[PDB]
Amino acid sequence: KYFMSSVRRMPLNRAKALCSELQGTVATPRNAEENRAIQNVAKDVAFLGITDQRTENVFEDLTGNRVRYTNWNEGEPNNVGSGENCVVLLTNGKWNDVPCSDSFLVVCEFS
Amino acid sequence: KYFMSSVRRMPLNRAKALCSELQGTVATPRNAEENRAIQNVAKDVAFLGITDQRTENVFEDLTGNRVRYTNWNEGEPNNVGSGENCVVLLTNGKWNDVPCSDSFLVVCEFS
Numbered sequence: 001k002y003f004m005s006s007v008r009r010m011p012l013n014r015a016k017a018l019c020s021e022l023q024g025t026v027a028t029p030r031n032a033e034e035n036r037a038i039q040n041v042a043k044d045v046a047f048l049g050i051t052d053q054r055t056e057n058v059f060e061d062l063t064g065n066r067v068r069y070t071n072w073n074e075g076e077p078n079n080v081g082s083g084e085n086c087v088v089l090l091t092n093g094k095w096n097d098v099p100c101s102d103s104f105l106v107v108c109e110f111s
Numbered sequence: 112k113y114f115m116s117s118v119r120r121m122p123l124n125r126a127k128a129l130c131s132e133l134q135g136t137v138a139t140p141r142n143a144e145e146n147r148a149i150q151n152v153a154k155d156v157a158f159l160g161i162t163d164q165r166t167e168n169v170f171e172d173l174t175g176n177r178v179r180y181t182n183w184n185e186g187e188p189n190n191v192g193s194g195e196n197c198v199v200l201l202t203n204g205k206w207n208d209v210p211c212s213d214s215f216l217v218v219c220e221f222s
């Protein structure tokens with residue numbers, strides 16, 4: 001598994017399109033080791049390939065597989081405002097759910 | 112080095128933008144092993160990061176570094192018509208110079 005980060009920010013739909021263009025997907029850490037590797041390639045807050053768009057509070061990857069390993073920041077996920085169904089990896093390595101329409105860097109994963 | 116192929120076709124400038132978006136560059140094979148590795152991922156004719164834009168018949172990689180290894184198809188490079196200053200890897204692994212404005216798949220290189 002190889003991780004590459006974008007230089008520009010974009011919403012999740014554009015992020016998915018970017019990783020998909022090179023036949024990869026938005027990065028989804030499956031353990032602490034991958035979480036750190038992703039954090040390291042990302043120089044700022046970046047999107048992960050995890051959402052609870054299908055079912056609220058049920059987080060799964062972009063292929064529908066419910067995630068097992070999580071690393072939520074204290075107080076997250078909180079689905080605040082009108083809702084937050086996407087996930088970003090903070091600069092300290094913890095996760096926060098955010099609106100999928102907001103823009104962040106993207107880390108793509110390839111195998 | 113890791114090589115990934117795009118799914119859509121695009122001109123060289125767009126190909127460069129795609130690869131650089133994930134901090135990589137358009138694939139430039141430095142030997143037959145890498146040439147074969149690029150073949151493995153390119154399901155159809157694809158752009159390589161080489162051009163003779165500066166001086167006709169002097170091929171350099173995208174950073175203006177003159178290349179050493181080449182694998183031209185018989186009869187190539189022929190700079191047909193108004194000129195062909197970009198390079199693509201054919202499905203047999205041999206190269207052909209083509210117009211930089213024409214669209215082809217792109218293979219990106221990372222390391």
Ligand SMILES: CC(=O)N[C@@H]1[C@@H](O)[C@H](O)[C@@H](CO)O[C@H]1O
Nearest residue numbers: 076078080084096097098099102
């Ligand atoms: C759009 C955005 O950044 N919203 C975040 C929210 O997701 C997070 O739960 C909260 C924690 O205090 O901080 C807000 O700023």
Ligand SMILES: CC(=O)N[C@@H]1[C@@H](O)[C@H](O)[C@@H](CO)O[C@H]1O
Nearest residue numbers: 187189191195207208209210213
């Ligand atoms: C746009 C294009 O594909 N032009 C190619 C040209 O680059 C190549 O040298 C020649 C060899 O016969 O075949 C042409 O079709």
Ligand SMILES: [Ca+2]
Nearest residue numbers: 052079084085
């Ligand atoms: Ca939610």
Ligand SMILES: [Ca+2]
Nearest residue numbers: 078079096097
């Ligand atoms: Ca939140």
Ligand SMILES: [Ca+2]
Nearest residue numbers: 163190195196
């Ligand atoms: Ca030429």
Ligand SMILES: [Ca+2]
Nearest residue numbers: 189190207208
């Ligand atoms: Ca030619």
